[PDB]
Design a binder for this molecule. Structure first.
Ligand code: AMP
Ligand code: AMP
Ligand code: AMP
Ligand code: AMP
Ligand code: CL
Ligand code: CL
Ligand code: CL
Ligand code: CL
Ligand code: CL
Ligand code: CL
Ligand code: CL
Ligand code: CL
Ligand code: CL
Ligand code: CL
Ligand code: CL
Ligand code: CL
Ligand code: CL
Ligand code: CL
Ligand code: CL
Ligand code: CL
Lengths: 326, 325, 325, 326
C-alpha cells in the first residue's frame, strides 16, 4: 500500500473532460501555429517571474496596447498546457483574453487591462465594491471549473481590475491544470498565503475546491482588513496559522477521513480550539463584516475540500444579495 | 407681497450674498449666440408644454448632442435657464450645456446613453439604488450650495448611463435662484413629487423642496411601487401624503406656519400615521434596510425645515456600503 | 435548372469544399433557444417586409442590445440567417449576434451608437471615406472568404459609431452561402445598389455582387450624389447604369453570357461611355483623386468577373493614406 | 547701445494679455490654495527630469488614474508660473488637464492619458494619421497662443496620444511663458533638436513663432522618416545643420534684418546654398511626401520668425484638406 485508496472525486464538474474531444485536454499533442512576432513591439517590462517575463506591447498593425509574455524555452508541456487552457477559456466570463501566439522563445499575446495594483486599489474598496468584484471573480472561477480547469493560483496579484470600467479579469494560468477524476496532482502549486490544507499535508487528490480556499483567503483578507489572513513564514508554519483558526479537532478528523499521513514535522502543532470568525472584527472592518459574510466565510475556509462551497454555491449565498442581478 | 408665516432655508441661505449681482441677475445677462447650422436634428426626442427636445449632431465634432429648442414667448425665463446652466458647469452629475444657438432659441446639451427609468429601475439592486441616488444627491447638494433649487426632481429628469455608471440631472427650466424670504410659484415640479408646501400654497419654500422630491424617488425605488404617492390631482396628492404621514404631524405643520386650508378637503379624515416598515412586503424586503427606514423617515416630512438637507442625506449611514468618504 | 452561360467565382469558390456539411447545411441546424424575458423592448427601431427591429435591454448585463423579431412564415430562411451569423462571429466589422430567443423568433444583436448615413456622410472627409470603406471591405472579404455573399450592401446596412471609429455590417437576412454553379434569386439587394447581373436576370452570380454594391456606395460618397444610379424602377436602374458605363461594354457583356434581353428596353438608346472624371464638380474635386478614378473604374463593371474582389480593392493604392499594411 | 532697438512684435495675438485681469499674467502673486495630498497615492514612477519627478497615481476617492508631478521646492516663480498657465488653459483643445494641486514640495495632479511612447507609435503612422494628429497639435498651439502663452518646448515627448480614442494632449508646460510685446526672453528654452534659429543666435525678442519652428521640426521628421530632422551635436552645430538646409543667404539676411550680433564662434560656418525639400524624399517616405506638404514645410521652417506660418494659418493649409472638417 503506497498510493492512497481512500480517494476524493469532485462534487461538481467531475466528468466534463470525458465529454470533450481528445484535442481539448491532450495539450502535449497540441500544434501551435505561430503568427509573425514583429507585429508586436515591446514598450516596457511590467515584471518577471523566473518562469516568465511579461512586457507592455503594441499591436503595430492594430495600434492597441497588449501584454506580451515571453516564456522560457526550457519547458514545452507546461508551455502548451497554458496555451491549451487559454484557448479553451477564450469566451469565458472575466477570463483574460489570449489574442495571439508568436515565436522567434514562445510569446503569448494577452489583452491589456488598464488596471491598478492591489496594494493600493483594495484599501479604497467599500462594502459593495468587495461584494461586486468578488462575485465577478466567482464568475470566472465557476466557468473554468465547469470547463474542467482549475486555476491553482488564485491571489489578488493574478486578478486585474479596471475600476474605471467595473471590469475584472483573472490572469496567470501557468499553474492551471485540467481535472480528471482520480488524478494525483503536484502539491507545489499556488502561493504560500493561499495554499489550501490539502497542499500543506501533501494530499494530491484535490479538485476545483483548491481555487475555493484561495478565494476564501482573499475574501477574508479584504473584509477583515488583514493582508494576508493566514500569515505564515513557511509552508509548515502556514498550516499552523490555519489550525490556529479552524482548530485541531476538525483538522485531525480531516486527516482521518482521507487517511492522510501527516509528517511528524507537524507534531509540534499543539492543541488548538476552533475560533469564532467574529473575533477578527474590529472598529476598522466592522462595516465590512456582516452576518451574511461570517456565514459565507465559515463555509468556504474548511479543511474538507468536499464540504467547501463551490463557486456556484458561493454565488447564490445571501452575502451577494445586495449586488446580484435577478 | 402676501402675509404669511415666514421661513428661511437653514442651509445655503446666504450663498447669493457671497456672489456678485452678475451671478443671479438672469435678466441682465447678455448671451453670445452661435450659428445653429453646426448642429442638425436626427431624431425628435420629447415634446413639451414649453419646449421640444431632439437628438442632435455636432457636425464638426460629429458626436451626439441633445438640442432643446424653446418657444420664444418668454425672454426672462429663457434667460433664467441659461443663467442657471451656466453657473453649474463644474457641478458633479449636472448636465453640461455645451452651447446656445438661434425665430427660436436652441440649447445644446451633452448626450447620455441611457435606458428609461421604469425599464432600468426594476433591474436595480440594493447596490444600484444606494450608488445612483448618492450620485443624484451630489448634483442636488452642489446646485443648492450654488443657490439654485431644481424644483423638478423626478426619474424622468435623471439620466443614467448604466454601462458607464454615470448620472446626470437634466431639465433646469423650472429651476430658480434662492434668495431668503421669497415666495416662489407653488406650480412647480410634477404631481407625484410635489412637496406638502406646494399643496397647501406655502410659497416661502427653499432647497428642501428637492429633498421631498428625492425622498419620493427613493421610497418608490426601495418599496417597489411607482409612484409612492399615487394621486389623481394635486388635492388627492395631499390626501395620499397624509394617509401615510398621519394627521397628527399634519396639524402641527399647519399650526407652525398658520396655513389656512382650502375648502375642498372638507371631507378629509383623521389618518393615524402608518409606520414606514408597514410598506415592506416579500418582494422588497431585501431592499428595505433598517438604516433606510431611518433615512426615509427624516426625508419625507411635512415641515420642510426638519427634512434632511442634501449633504446631511449623503452622510447618512444608508450610503455606507457605497460611499468612499 | 435553367439553361444559360455559366460563371464561377474566380476567388473563394471552393471555401465550402473545405468545410463540413455542418457549415452550410442551414436546414439541418438545431438552434438552442433561450428565454426571451432576459431582454425587454425599449423603443421600436425599424419596420420591415419580413421582420421588426427594436431597441433592447439585456436585463442581467443591462447593456443596450438590438432585437430583430421575425414573422415565422419561413423556417428555412430564418435558419439561414442564424446559420450565417453564427459562422461569422469572429469576422472583423461583422455584427455580433448575441443570442436567439422565442409564437415568433427573436435575434439579439449588439448595439452600435451611430448617426444615420445621410446625416453623417455629408460630414465625411477624404480620410473618413477611405478609412470607413476599408473597414467595410474587411467585413465583405471575410464573409466572402467564408463562402457567404451579403447581397444587400447599402449605407442603411452599415452601422458606424464615429465617436469610436467603429463599423459593423448588419442585416444578413438576404445573405446566402455560395456553391459554384448555383442560380441565386435576382430579387436581392435594393434598387440603387443592384448589379447588372440582377437586372438582366443572370442568376449565376457570386461574391462580386457585393462589390458592385460597394462601388455604388463609394462612387456616391466621393462624387457627393446619393444615389449615384438614381432609377425609378429596376428597368430604369439598368438604363441609368448603361447611361454611364456605355453601350459598347454592355454589348460585350450580353454576348459573353448570351443574355437575351427583355422586350421593355425596346427604346433604349446607344449611350457613348462617359468617363469617370466627368462627374468631378467644384464641390467634390477634393474627394476625387486620380487613384480613386482607377479604383471606381475597376469596381463598377458589367462583367462581374472583371470586377475587383474585396481583397483586391483593399490592396489598391486608393487606401494607401489609411491602410497600415 | 546695449539692448537691441530693431525689435519684433508678434503678428498675431500681440496684445491679448492687456485685455485680461492682472491676476491672469501676474503669476508671481498667485495664491495657490492647496488640497489634501493623501487623496493621491503614488503607484509607479513614470520618469524624471531634474526640475521634476512624475509618477503614476490614484485618486483614492475617485479611484481613477492620474499623474502626479512633484516639483522641486527650490523655485517658486517657475512653480506658480506653470500652475498659472495650466489654470488659464484649463478648457483648451488638446491641452493637458490639471485636476488638483497638493503640497506637503508642491504636487500637481494631471489627467492620465493611456498613451504609447513616440519611438514606437509614430513608425506605425499612415499619411492621414500624421495629418490628423498634427492638426490636433495645431489646435492646442493656436489656443494657448490666442491666450498669450507660448509653450517653448514642443517635441514628440511632450505630446501624448491615445490612439485608441484618437486623442491628443500637449503636456509639460514648465517652460511655457506669457507673451508681452517687446519682452526679452531666456533663449535657454526648448530642446536642441527643436530650437529655433532665434534661440541659437540669442535673439530674445521671439514670440509664439517659437512653437511653430518646433512644430515644423516635428512634421518634417515624421513625414521624411528622419528623427531628428536637424541632428546637431551641440547648440552651435544645431545651427549649422539648419544653415545646411535653409542656406546661408537667407541666414545672413535674417541677421541683418534684426541686427543680430552673431558670435564669431559661428564664423566657421561656410557658404551653404538653400536645398530643395524634395531632396530628402526617398522610397520609404515617398507616400508621405506630397506637393502640399513640401509647400507647408517650406513656409514653416523659416529663419524669419515673423514670416513663418502661424498655428491658424498652418491649419488652413491645403495639406490638412483631406482631414479638415468643414
Ligand atoms: N493583462 C494585463 N494587463 C495589465 N497588466 C498585466 C496584465 N497581465 C499581467 N500584468 C502585470 O504583470 C505583472 C505580473 O507579472 P508576473 O509577475 O510575471 O506574473 C503585474 O505587474 C501585472 O499587473
Ligand atoms: N441629454 C440627454 N441625453 C439622452 N437623452 C435625453 C437627454 N435629455 C433628454 N433625453 C430624453 O428625453 C426624454 C426626457 O424628456 P425631455 O427632457 O422633455 O426631452 C427622455 O426620453 C430622455 O431619454
Ligand atoms: N445593431 C444596431 N445598432 C444600432 N442601430 C441599429 C442596429 N440595427 C439596426 N439599427 C437601426 O435600424 C435601422 C436600420 O433598419 P433595420 O435593419 O430594418 O432596423 C436604422 O435606423 C438603424 O440605426
Ligand atoms: N498625462 C500623462 N499621461 C501619461 N503619461 C504621462 C503624462 N504626463 C507625463 N507622462 C509621462 O511622463 C514621462 C515624462 O516625464 P518628464 O521627463 O519628467 O517630463 C513620459 O514617460 C510620459 O509618457
Ligand atoms: Cl456537475
Ligand atoms: Cl479530437
Ligand atoms: Cl486603426
Ligand atoms: Cl474564539
Ligand atoms: Cl457685485
Ligand atoms: Cl416660475
Ligand atoms: Cl399617531
Ligand atoms: Cl444596511
Ligand atoms: Cl463532413
Ligand atoms: Cl432568397
Ligand atoms: Cl465609346
Ligand atoms: Cl490620392
Ligand atoms: Cl490678433
Ligand atoms: Cl485682477
Ligand atoms: Cl466610484
Ligand atoms: Cl538641393
Amino acid at each position: 500500500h503506497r498510493h492512497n485508496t481512500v480517494q476524493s472525486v469532485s462534487r461538481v464538474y467531475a466528468d466534463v473532460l470525458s465529454t470533450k474531444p481528445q484535442s481539448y485536454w491532450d495539450y502535449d499533442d497540441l500544434n501551435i501555429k505561430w503568427n509573425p512576432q514583429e507585429n508586436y513591439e515591446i514598450l516596457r517590462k511590467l515584471g518577471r517571474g523566473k518562469y516568465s517575463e511579461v512586457f507592455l506591447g503594441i499591436d503595430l498593425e492594430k495600434r492597441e496596447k497588449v501584454v506580451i509574455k515571453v516564456l522560457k524555452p526550457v519547458k514545452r508541456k507546461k508551455i502548451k498546457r497554458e496555451i491549451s487552457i487559454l484557448k479553451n477559456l477564450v469566451d469565458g466570463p472575466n477570463i483574460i483574453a489570449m489574442l495571439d501566439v508568436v515565436r522567434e522563445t514562445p510569446g503569448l499575446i494577452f489583452e491589456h487591462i488598464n488596471n491598478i495594483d492591489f496594494r493600493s486599489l483594495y484599501p479604497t474598496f467599500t462594502d459593495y465594491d468587495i461584494r461586486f468584484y468578488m462575485y465577478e471573480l466567482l464568475k470566472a472561477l465557476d466557468y473554468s471549473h465547469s470547463m474542467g480547469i482549475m486555476h491553482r493560483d488564485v491571489k489578488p496579484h493574478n486578478v486585474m481590475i479596471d475600476h474605471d470600467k467595473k471590469l475584472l479579469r483573472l490572469i496567470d494560468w501557468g499553474l492551471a491544470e485540467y481535472y480528471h477524476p482520480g488524478t494525483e496532482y503536484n502539491v507545489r502549486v499556488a502561493s504560500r498565503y493561499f495554499k489550501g490544507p490539502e497542499l500543506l499535508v501533501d494530499y494530491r487528490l484535490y479538485d476545483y475546491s483548491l481555487d475555493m480556499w484561495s478565494f476564501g483567503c482573499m475574501l477574508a483578507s479584504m473584509v477583515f482588513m488583514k493582508e494576508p489572513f493566514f500569515h505564515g513564514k513557511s509552508n509548515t508554519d502556514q498550516l499552523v496559522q490555519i489550525v490556529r483558526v479552524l482548530g485541531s479537532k476538525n483538522f485531525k478528523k480531516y486527516l482521518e477521513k482521507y487517511n492522510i499521513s501527516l509528517g511528524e514535522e507537524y507534531e509540534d502543532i499543539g492543541y488548538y480550539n476552533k475560533r469564532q470568525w467574529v473575533r477578527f472584527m474590529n472598529e476598522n472592518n466592522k462595516d465590512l463584516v456582516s452576518q451574511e459574510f461570517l456565514d459565507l466565510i465559515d463555509r468556504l475556509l474548511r479543511y474538507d475540500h468536499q464540504e467547501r462551497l463551490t463557486a456556484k454555491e458561493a454565488m447564490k449565498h445571501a452575502y451577494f444579495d445586495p449586488i446580484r442581478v435577478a
